[PDB]
Design a protein around this ligand. Sequence first.
Ligand SMILES: O[C@@H]1[C@@H](O)[C@H](O)OC[C@H]1O
Ligand SMILES: O[C@@H]1[C@@H](O)[C@H](O)OC[C@H]1O
Ligand SMILES: O[C@@H]1[C@@H](O)[C@H](O)OC[C@H]1O
Ligand SMILES: O[C@@H]1[C@@H](O)[C@H](O)OC[C@H]1O
Lengths: 500, 500, 500, 500
Amino acid sequence: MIKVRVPDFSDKKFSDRWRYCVGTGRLGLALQKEYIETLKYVKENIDFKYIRGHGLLCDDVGIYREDVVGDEVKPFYNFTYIDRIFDSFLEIGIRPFVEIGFMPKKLASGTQTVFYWEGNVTPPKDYEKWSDLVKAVLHHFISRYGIEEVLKWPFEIWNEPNLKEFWKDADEKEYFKLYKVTAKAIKEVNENLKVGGPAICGGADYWIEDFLNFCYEENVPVDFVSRHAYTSKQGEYTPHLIYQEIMPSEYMLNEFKTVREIIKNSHFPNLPFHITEYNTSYSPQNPVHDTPFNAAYIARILSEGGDYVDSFSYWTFSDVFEERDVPRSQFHGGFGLVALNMIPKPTFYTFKFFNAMGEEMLYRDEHMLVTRRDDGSVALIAWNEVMDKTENPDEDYEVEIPVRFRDVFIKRQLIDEEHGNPWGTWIHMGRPRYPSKEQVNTLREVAKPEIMTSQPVANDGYLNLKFKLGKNAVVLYELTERIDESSTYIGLDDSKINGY
Amino acid sequence: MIKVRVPDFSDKKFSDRWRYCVGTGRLGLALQKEYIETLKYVKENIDFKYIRGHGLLCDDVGIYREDVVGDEVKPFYNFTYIDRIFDSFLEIGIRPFVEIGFMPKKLASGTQTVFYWEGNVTPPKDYEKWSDLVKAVLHHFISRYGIEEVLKWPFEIWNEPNLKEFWKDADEKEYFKLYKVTAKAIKEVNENLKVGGPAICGGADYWIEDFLNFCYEENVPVDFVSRHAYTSKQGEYTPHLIYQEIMPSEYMLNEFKTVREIIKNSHFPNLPFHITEYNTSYSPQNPVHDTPFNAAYIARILSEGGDYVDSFSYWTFSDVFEERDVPRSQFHGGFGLVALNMIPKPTFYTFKFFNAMGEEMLYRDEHMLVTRRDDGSVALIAWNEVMDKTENPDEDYEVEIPVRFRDVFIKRQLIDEEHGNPWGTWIHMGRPRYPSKEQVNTLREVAKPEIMTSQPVANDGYLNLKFKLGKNAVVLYELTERIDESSTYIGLDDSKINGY
Amino acid sequence: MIKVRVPDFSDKKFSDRWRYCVGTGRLGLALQKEYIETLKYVKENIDFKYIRGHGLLCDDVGIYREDVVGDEVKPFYNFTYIDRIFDSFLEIGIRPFVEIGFMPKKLASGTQTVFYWEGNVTPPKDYEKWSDLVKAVLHHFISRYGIEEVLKWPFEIWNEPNLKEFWKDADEKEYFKLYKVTAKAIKEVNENLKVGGPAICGGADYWIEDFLNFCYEENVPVDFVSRHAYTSKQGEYTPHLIYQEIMPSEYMLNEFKTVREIIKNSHFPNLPFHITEYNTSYSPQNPVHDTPFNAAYIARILSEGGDYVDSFSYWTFSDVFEERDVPRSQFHGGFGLVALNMIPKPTFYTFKFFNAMGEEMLYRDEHMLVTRRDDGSVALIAWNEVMDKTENPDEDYEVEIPVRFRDVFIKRQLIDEEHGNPWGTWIHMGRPRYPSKEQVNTLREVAKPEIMTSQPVANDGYLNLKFKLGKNAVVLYELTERIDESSTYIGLDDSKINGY
Amino acid sequence: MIKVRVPDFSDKKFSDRWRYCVGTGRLGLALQKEYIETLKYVKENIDFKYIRGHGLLCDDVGIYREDVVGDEVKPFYNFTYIDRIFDSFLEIGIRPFVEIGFMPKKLASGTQTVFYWEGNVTPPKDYEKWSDLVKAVLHHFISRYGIEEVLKWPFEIWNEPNLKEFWKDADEKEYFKLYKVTAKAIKEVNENLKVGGPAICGGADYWIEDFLNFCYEENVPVDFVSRHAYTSKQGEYTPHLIYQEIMPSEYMLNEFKTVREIIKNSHFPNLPFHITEYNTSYSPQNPVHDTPFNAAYIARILSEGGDYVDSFSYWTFSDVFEERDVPRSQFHGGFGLVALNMIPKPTFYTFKFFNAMGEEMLYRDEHMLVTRRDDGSVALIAWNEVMDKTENPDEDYEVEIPVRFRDVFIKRQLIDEEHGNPWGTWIHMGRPRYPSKEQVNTLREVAKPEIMTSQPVANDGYLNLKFKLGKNAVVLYELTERIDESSTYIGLDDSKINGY
Ligand SMILES: O[C@@H]1[C@@H](O)[C@H](O)OC[C@H]1O
Ligand SMILES: O[C@@H]1[C@@H](O)[C@H](O)OC[C@H]1O
Ligand SMILES: O[C@@H]1[C@@H](O)[C@H](O)OC[C@H]1O
Ligand SMILES: O[C@@H]1[C@@H](O)[C@H](O)OC[C@H]1O
């Protein structure tokens, strides 16, 4: 097995940076009833601070318009939708991690678009008009939400401009020009608004180096660096899905650690660092996302990720997504922590379990995290992902947890391939594309972790836990102080009940 | 083990008489927020048609009042509370199985009361005034709810008048006088209103014989017979609780069968028969009610009870009860199917599981019920209660269920001492009398049955199920037709996912 | 003034055909949270049976797709969205008055589109593929909702094919070919499904004549005729709005009466007739829709319209609309009975008031409707729209209403330019485009009719009502029987209260 | 008329002391669904900080019990109900202004009770047992709610001990003994808990003098003085109601000012002062409470009361009351700001209107209050109660309000005998005792103030308001800055709409 003796003293500290932000589909989809039910649902379980998605400036949200009064062409800024959208984000208690872009149609210089919803990926045919666009939006936000509020929303400029698909010809030099005009426009409204970039994705860190040199040398303000991180190798698309190999979690944590260095060695060594987007597969159609595997895999990233970054946003919170057309089945490898019909995927409970963690970090290794809360209670999260096809995935443990109590109440929650695996049951049902109300209900019933309570006594100050982790399992133990009130029940004796 | 080959043809039929009615605490408690949340909660899971409780005429509901205008003493009927009460019963979609009584204070002839809330158990000092009371209430009901509605509410006269505690000196002859004056008063308002009695409890069936002879001979209208049934022997009260031996279920079913005969041999052989109240222990403080045992025990009664009676009301739906003062702990042996804070006891899921049963009864024995629904799907409920203290409570099964399909989707739900046993966890926690919000949450999380899906194939038209029932376990299997859509997912291959 | 003596006897009868159906924006918008809140809101006030809108087959709903597996091109029908959409329609208790169309992109033969959302207006490049599309959808509906349900949904083929904008070159002969292939496809699935057309709009009734001759002669099944009706003359668009003259209501009622004749003189004289769309202005940007005028104007149509048609659907129930891009202000002349943020426009209360009408029609003239309910109570609705710019819009009345009671309780609700005129207040506020939460609240507070109760006595069986209707006012009077219980309050005397 | 020129500069300041606390029926009634719906309803409109009521220790809540184990008699403290009660108070966001008392049955020394619910009004037969009772409760509160929370709850000892009905023989010397034992018991648990008294009612201030001398001389801790205030003269009870003359508001404000002096001249000159209970009539059956008069009368007290006291609690928030048996009609002169079925009485809107007031008090006289909010907007509340039976109750005004804007948006809300007078309509209906669902709905529809918006321009910095106050009327004007956006609507011209 694997024996461990969790030390009674706290050296390091565990932060809630893992729940600072979550990813989402384009802001236009936030108008959907399904979207908001899920957001509320998710917020009642995980207290994410911000939400990050594309499309703020796309035409479905329809902010940028133009009116013709003869020969005169004046721009018109329509806020009917982002108002409703941002109003609903705040109502639920979540701030927007604004991402400026993409390029509105009546402002584009080219015709290249991206995704099924076709967002324009070309630069403005007139940066002057673009600058006024940006300023008109911020002023409006300030106008409706107050400067104190807006001041808390960071502004990421564009998305993966290092890719030909998101930025015309990956024109690095043009991006920096976009960054400057926008960073300037924003700071014009209020010098305190947070702005950053480059929003690139793994495999072009030189972009961040140039991005930071560019700002220093051209005197462009930067408030934070932005980047994405995934671990899926190349795969070939089916007209339905893609399967990819997932590199171990270690390689993502290195990318975090790496880009951290590039920042501390730049002219802005103290800039905050935000992984504005992460997950295993970078495709909205890879079933890895629906598997109990994805949950055990991410478990580690939530465990260590916060040591190197200021925040890392899981892409995404819901399957309400359209980049590759409308989903075509209950389960389809969508990014979301929650599937359609608010059916929590196992990855959802990994996040849920981390709500149990406390400030004091007592122990931690590649597959386990043990912390202590304010009240003195302890919580442990172990996870056993199976990266390969082993015959014996199992893993036994025997952890000695220190406890300031003698009588310990134990609450155990388990998530593996047999528990909290709606995807597995979906298969049992025959992979229905459009399940019926009852199939959906059965799924919802299955989509809950297994809970086991118990009650042991800690001797010599330590409680010894023994347990086995099945394939891709993830377990959480919360050990609190048990204060028995049994002696208060005059005549209490369960043995006086038939069979007990 | 125990092998069974469920026949493919249906002889007998299974009815929903088991869910016709449920018991409740005095109607005054229906004013409590806690009460109504629980009623709604329960109705969303079990479609009970009627609700039966005492106190309609007690003073907390305050219908009967008297005003003094000098020497003149006129009665005043206050409907502020039963209006709200009955309005809320209908809003939720449940009809009242009205029980006239007890005796209001300003109408009583004695001072003897019953229960902690002290309901007057003496006859009216003036049956004339009582008759006008009854008529004024019915007219009001008719007035607010319409005659079509009221016409559906049966009226039970008094409660266990065979006991000295509920009726002064158990005056049988006086009861019949009460019955007549009331039965007459009611029929005066509308000859179609349903009325019956004697509402006695086990061990005095001669009361029903005399009750029926009395009506025939004195020409008093009867529309239904009423009686209670329990199976707890004598026990000694603690200032906190009582423990009692529970006689096997067979003896309750005999009482049903028995009183059935007494009716078919009377002058009114076709009168409907209502067990307006039943359960294992007749005390609101016997922990048997909170145990997974009670659930497995009642399972049988829900299985056969309907063969002999028109309805049998489980006493009660909630622990919102006060007969023996306010409860003093999360679990205290209350009658309710649901404990305070809407925590379902295991007995609750027995009822829940029976919602799965269909009209066609294929097989049935002392511990198992197997039926078929309209769609052709099959549902099975097995139960293994442990009446004694055996070392090997287990019981294996191997049932051959006939199926009109070849591909079968299976949904299994299990309730035993390890699953859906909040009471057990309550013990783990140290029997807290006033649990904290989180203890209550853990309980709610534990208070759900275990669900397992799977997917086998039926060969030769039969699917073979093998399974073990632990101590006091109760399981439900729903076998529906599995229509696989997997071939629609181009390139679908789970083996292309890390570890699968 | 205007004196009237409502006769005590009922000749004609008033039907609820006015609430059979309502219009809506494209079905895709039904995915919006805003949309559904409003639908629920509206359904709680007006019991519309069906809802009619375009876009069932447009690409945002995304039903029609195509997968490429080499050289093989197989079609794929995605039901993820209409399932959610139709599921939510039924959840709220409203049936879809299905309108097949428009033309999906991967099936179109041309490139001509209509509206801001660009629905393809060209015929299929292969009617064979189109026929399979239609059949696949109906089978799916049957599959999820059951044949008994679907059988209640009528199917209208296309929209205004008489206009070059909705049908390529208004090819009448091509439309009939579309109608036939579709009507055949539908009837193939189930011979009982209701289907009809031509869905034309005023000024081309010859289309209905040819449509009916075409079906008779070519043996194409028809189950109902479909047409639209508006009364707005030509107007010139602004890049923001359009103003149009509204012809009196008489001309719309004639169009109803007219097309009725064309049907009774055809080969199908008994076919039902549905005005699947109506209102004053046919533009989603004419402020007439937001004015208390529109409410008084439609009042008449709800009064007489049902005499000539089987149903007439008000276009539309909500301002959640996108035909002319996203709205750009709280009030913008949208079709909806309800403005964004669920602010009821005055037209909404006209419909609300008609919920008061009963079966027995006692009196009716060009500006007043008087009916009697089952209980014998009477309800009156008078309205005074101002079509021109008069100096004295007022109108006095003096109606003698017959009453089976002597003591009458009166409930009066008034809607005019001073009451229930959110639009007016919006102006007061300075026409904010994006009102704040409180501005929206004030509007919601203003957006309610004025209510006045009173209590007179009917002498000689008649109650005399005297009242004045302001500009565009609309009033409703409900006279019920007052049963005074005052004598039950011993010592009741309001004059014993300071000042009374 | 009455001309006034509100000064542009702020001398005095207006506080929210008027909304610090509200009265309630005994805590046991807080278990009622009706009670809590109303509390929530009320809290969504008025942000009361605390809630004060009797019965914490009465037997329906059932805290104090005793178990017999032979000859041994140990006390048992049951917290099942106050837990639910206080839990629900905090859930809604309202703190309890705890009032210790009355005397539990198994602790009483006499048999004298008070009210329909019979609370024991005799002292403990053993102060030792009583002291342990108090301490056990506080420890439990601390235990479940945390010391930081409980520390915010003030503790008032007993109720009107100056009356023979609430304290045996009004034994002043015994009360002080009660006060000491309790004040000591409390301070034992935590020296910081707030405690005070004497809770007397008008006409015995010498009690407060002795109470303060008693504490100083006997060294008993005091943290606040407590007293009640009413203005209803003697009246004679009917078996249904009582009518009383209401002395002008001036006399209540004097009582406030008076008792203030008695405190500043005592040995504890800085003790806070709480009018833990006030209203016009001190009877739960005087229709004055339901009249628009009561609303205009209290308007003044909310205006000036805060100048002399730390808080004054309106008795009560709801008609959910039982002191004089269960109410017997929709309107019955109950204390509540809200009648049963959540129908706001006019007094409710007086409180609602004061939510509009700001910190800066610009002007104030016996019938008007004018303030300015942070944003610079102004709000005015005028009221015209009719104390006598005048032929001309009317009162004209002409106020000059200073405004930092030129374009002013006006929102006017009016409450008088014709608007927001459910009681009046109730009369119209014939004073139904048990209204039907629709009668209740009409009432709810009538029970709203009249709102009128408008839009004028302020010249020379002042806006001139002219208006008439009807009988017992109460009006609120909120003048905010109007920022017109009309010029943004290209082609906007309402005159192009039929009739405009
Ligand atoms: O939009 C997402 C993009 O930002 C990321 O880089 O790759 C995955 C996509 O879903
Ligand atoms: O009130 C119930 C009574 O009717 C029954 O007979 O015994 C149990 C009690 O709870
Ligand atoms: O879509 C609608 C169309 O059907 C009708 O004919 O004209 C008005 C439009 O909004
Ligand atoms: O209980 C209240 C009492 O405290 C007060 O003094 O008089 C009115 C009563 O309702």
